[PDB]
Design brief:
This is part of a larger assembly, with chains A, B, C, D and E.
Chain A (H helix, E strand, L loop, with lengths): L10 E2 L6 E2 L4 H4 L8 H10 L13 H12 L27 H18 L2 H8 L18
Antiparallel strand pairs in A: 1-2
Chain B lengths: L13 H10 L5 E2 L1 H8 L3 H13 L4 E5 L4 E4 L5
Antiparallel strand pairs in B: 1-3, 2-3
Chain C lengths: L7 E8 L9 E8 L6 E7 L7 E4 L11
Antiparallel strand pairs in C: 1-2, 1-4, 2-3
The chains are: A mainly alpha, B alpha+beta, C mainly beta, D mainly alpha, E alpha+beta.
The structure holds one RNA strand.
GO molecular function, one term (chain A): rRNA binding
InterPro entries (chain A): Rbsml_uS13_C, Ribosomal_uS13, Ribosomal_uS13-like_H2TH, Ribosomal_uS13_CS
GO cellular component, one term (chain A): small ribosomal subunit
Chain lengths: ~140, ~80, ~70, ~190, ~180
RNA sequence: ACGAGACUCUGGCAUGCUAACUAGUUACGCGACCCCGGUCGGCGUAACUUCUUAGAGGGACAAGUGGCGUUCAGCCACCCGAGAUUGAGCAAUAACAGGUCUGUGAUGCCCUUAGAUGUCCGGGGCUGCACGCGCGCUACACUGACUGGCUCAGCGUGUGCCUACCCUACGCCGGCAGGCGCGGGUAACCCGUUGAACCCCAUUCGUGAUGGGGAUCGGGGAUUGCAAUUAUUCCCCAUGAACGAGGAAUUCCCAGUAAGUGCGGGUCAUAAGCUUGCGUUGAUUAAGUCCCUGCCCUUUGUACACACCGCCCGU
């Protein structure tokens, strides 16, 4: 119960990143890049794990259950508007992407914008503010 | 000017549990903050342990609030 | 120092003008209860009136002016 | 049937103000005894009308500072109530007697004012008013509890409780006693 | 872990000391005595210099070591008063010489205790009492009873073996003293 | 004679006067529920102005008392009393090379006037970025963040002239931003008893740049409009930077005041980090001074008078 159980794992290696077991399970997997605070609640709600438990004392069955839920969102009654990548420009399907995939997709998106030589790609290549805000006063630490 | 970086444990081990069971009911003023300061434990663990001893009948409740709870020891006689 | 001066409790009798650079303090004519004959003038800081008792740590000093 | 006015659950009688110079600046006995430290106000209109305010109401009024707490009187009332409960549960004494003793022992009796031109450093020691002693005591205890309860797991309702406990004995482990003794030493250094 | 330098918990009056300033204040400042286990002192604005000042940060310089003389010590409430205005340059040389030799002795013995792996304030107090405070009280020299002790015991083992502290820890401390003070 | 004062508006009160189905109160009857009474902003009609609304009047004048003062102009405190200093509006002579020719079919002179400095359309710029400064918004957390429940206002505005563009109850669809049928209000009638926020109660969090903070950046979906890329605005999911109470210096204020907190109006097809008002919670300090920065009167000195930001001597 309140006494620490046997083989309480201190760290986790979910998707090749260190995840501590001291944080809450609704918030320890937030440190996985691509999954935030709101996305972590739905994954742990479709799967039958209570959110009052800690991260390092859950077992491998429910760990791999929520891991396959995170790599396969849509086949577990998760709606299509809950996804960080909807209607992708290459394959055209709704797919939630994770950390290294997120960096790869952002890198190839910026490469595509620079290749097509749009204004957004040119501003991203120059390293300035691209969303269209005033740069006369704010943004002083860009260079020395 | 000592830093002394804090590491507050989340789950009770063997020794902190029975030192709590031998020292916390012998305290004049019992508060989750002060027992977390004395035993170097996390705040939610302190609240859970004091709720457990409140259910066990070794802790007398005085006042209950959303900001803090105040607990006191029982009489020896 | 080698002197443990006993503290004196003294009662004001009148309020004189307000001295100081910015008028922060005022002068009072204060008298003691253990000897109700000795009366000295003291510079007191704060809101005072006629009737309040002041705790004097020493009783042998006379009130200096603003400078 | 108001025999005595219970301050929540505490009696207002059998309390002693030891300092004779503060007999009419501590309004706790038999006239200014209310059930709650919340009143309508109208004490800061005249020149000496704030001396008739009760000391626990003045403590709740001076408790709320630092921008994000201005106007929140009810929260200061419940923190003061929990602090009084903790003081009674710890020392086994009446919380009004601890608060009154914390006022007397934390009040400075001699202060040095700055004299000279704008830029030079020169002090001159003067004695203080009985009202200003009470005001400095309340301000020092409140800012000591506020500084003690900052970036810490310890709540302010027991930080204020330990503030009044240490000030009532003069143990010099509190902020208010230390600042009082600092002011006394600076005043005594150049009399 | 840190331990105090000398057996006196508070310094005597009119004693020189190397002080690091912690923070500037309004009426005074807050400082820390290095050779008395980092207790909070106070330096005054009127105790800075006899002449006029045009910059308070020109001579205070929070984050820098300063030599001050003790003025008033109250052991009952832990109140320390310091004065930089009365400090003469004649004793200043002896001041940082004593401070450097005391801090090198403290560093060597702290390294020896860290090798011995004892983390307790009472344990450091007991071992440092067995090592340095005993011969300091024997020779009757505050600060001067340690550097000369290690200088005379680097080449003589019989002088170092007179202390009945331990055997293995004593040999480790003797080797650490002979390795450094050569 | 002007200025001040006097005057005008508003706030604070009168169980007395005048009247309220576009505002209510109290009795009576019907109706619903609970265990003989209680609740109903459910329904309706016998008096009334206690709430609300707004008109005439009343009330405060240093009036009474005690001290200080030539016992004159006045000052201090107290009793009875809703008030014994509410807040604003208006505001004299003399001038400033103060700002406005970009408010004007107010205007002298000068320039241009058909390849126009008039006018109109299309595109762009007014946002552009090694840097500096000013007014501001959000934070640095546990007097706190998140998640539910409970509960309380006042100023306003609202279907437009050539002028097209109003505020919205109710029912359905969709997580949300939103979309479609139906009705009301030219307004104490409808939105609306304006179920506002801050607060209060109860979980989760535990001193960790952390569930603080939300900058930067990617994808998708709606609305306005002829047109949004240099992202109009909003919504959803990711990304999670600096920032640990701020150096020299400096601004504003003393009573329902500062501060915290939200709501209206102005710009508005789309629209507030600005301004102007409104209400809620609600303090610490002070009834003084001329030290700093300045102001009013008198005396004195002056080689200054576009007036000390003056004048003026020598190598």
């Amino acid at each position: 119960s309140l006494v620490i159980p046997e083989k309480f794992q201190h760290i986790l290696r979910v998707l090749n990143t260190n995840i501590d077991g001291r944080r809450k399970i609704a918030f320890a997997i937030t440190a996985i890049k691509g999954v935030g605070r709101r996305y972590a609640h739905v994954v742990l709600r479709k799967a039958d794990i209570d959110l009052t438990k800690r991260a390092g004392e859950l077992t491998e069955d429910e760990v791999e259950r929520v891991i396959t839920i995170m790599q396969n969102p849509r086949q577990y009654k998760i709606p299509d508007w809950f996804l960080n990548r909807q209607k992708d420009v290459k394959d055209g399907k709704y797919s939630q992407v994770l950390a290294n995939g997120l960096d790869n997709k952002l890198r190839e998106d910026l490469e595509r914008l620079k290749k097509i030589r749009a204004h957004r790609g040119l501003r991203h290549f120059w390293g300035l503010r691209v969303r269209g805000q005033h740069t006369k006063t704010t943004g002083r630490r860009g260079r020395t | 000017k000592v830093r002394d970086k804090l590491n507050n444990l989340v789950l009770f081990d063997k020794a902190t549990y029975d030192k709590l069971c031998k020292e916390v009911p012998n305290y004049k003023l019992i508060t989750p903050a002060v027992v977390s300061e004395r035993l170097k434990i996390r705040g939610s663990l302190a609240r859970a342990a004091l709720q457990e001893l409140l259910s066990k009948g070794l802790i007398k409740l005085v006042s209950k609030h959303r900001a803090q709870v105040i607990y006191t020891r029982n009489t020896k006689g | 120092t080698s002197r443990v001066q006993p503290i004196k409790l003294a009662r004001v009798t009148k309020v004189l003008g307000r001295t100081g650079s910015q008028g922060q303090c005022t002068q009072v004519r204060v008298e003691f209860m253990d000897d109700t004959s000795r009366s000295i003038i003291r510079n007191v800081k704060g809101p005072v009136r006629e009737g309040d008792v002041l705790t004097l740590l020493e009783s042998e000093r006379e009130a200096r002016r603003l400078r | 049937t108001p025999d005595i006015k219970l301050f929540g659950k505490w009696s207002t009688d059998d309390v002693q103000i030891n300092d004779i110079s503060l007999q009419d600046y501590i309004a706790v006995k038999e006239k200014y005894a209310k059930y709650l430290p919340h009143s309508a106000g109208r004490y800061a209109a005249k020149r000496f009308r704030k001396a008739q305010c009760p000391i626990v109401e003045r403590l709740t009024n001076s408790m709320m500072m630092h921008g994000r707490n201005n106007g929140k009187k009810l929260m200061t009332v419940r923190i003061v109530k929990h602090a009084f409960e903790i003081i009674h549960l710890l020392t086994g004494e009446n919380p009004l007697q601890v608060l009154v003793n914390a006022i007397i022992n934390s009040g400075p009796r001699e202060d040095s004012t700055r004299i000279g031109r704008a830029g030079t450093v020169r002090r001159q020691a003067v004695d203080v008013s009985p009202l200003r002693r009470v005001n400095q005591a309340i301000w020092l205890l409140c800012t000591g509890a506020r500084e003690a309860a900052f970036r810490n797991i310890k709540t302010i309702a027991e930080c204020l409780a330990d503030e009044l406990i240490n000030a009532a004995k003069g143990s010099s482990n509190s902020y208010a006693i230390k600042k009082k003794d600092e002011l006394e030493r600076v005043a005594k250094s150049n009399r | 872990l840190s331990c105090r330098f000398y057996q006196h918990k508070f310094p005597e009056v009119e004693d020189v000391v190397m002080v690091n300033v912690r923070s500037i204040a309004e009426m005074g400042a807050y400082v820390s005595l290095l050779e008395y286990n980092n207790i909070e002192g106070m330096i005054l604005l009127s105790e800075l210099s006899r002449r006029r000042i045009r910059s308070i940060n020109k001579l205070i310089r929070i984050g820098r070591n300063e030599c001050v003389v003790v003025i008033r010590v109250d052991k009952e409430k832990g109140y320390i008063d310091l004065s930089k205005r009365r400090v003469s340059p004649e004793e200043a040389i002896k001041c940082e010489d004593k401070f450097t030799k005391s801090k090198t002795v403290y560093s060597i013995l702290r390294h020896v205790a860290e090798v011995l792996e004892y983390t307790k304030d009472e344990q450091l107090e007991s071992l440092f009492q067995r090592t340095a405070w005993v011969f300091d009280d024997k020779y009757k020299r505050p600060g001067y009873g340690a550097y000369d002790a290690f200088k005379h015991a680097v080449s003589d083992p019989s002088i170092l073996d007179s202390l009945d502290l331990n055997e293995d820890e004593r040999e480790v401390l003797i080797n650490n003293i002979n390795r450094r003070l050569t």
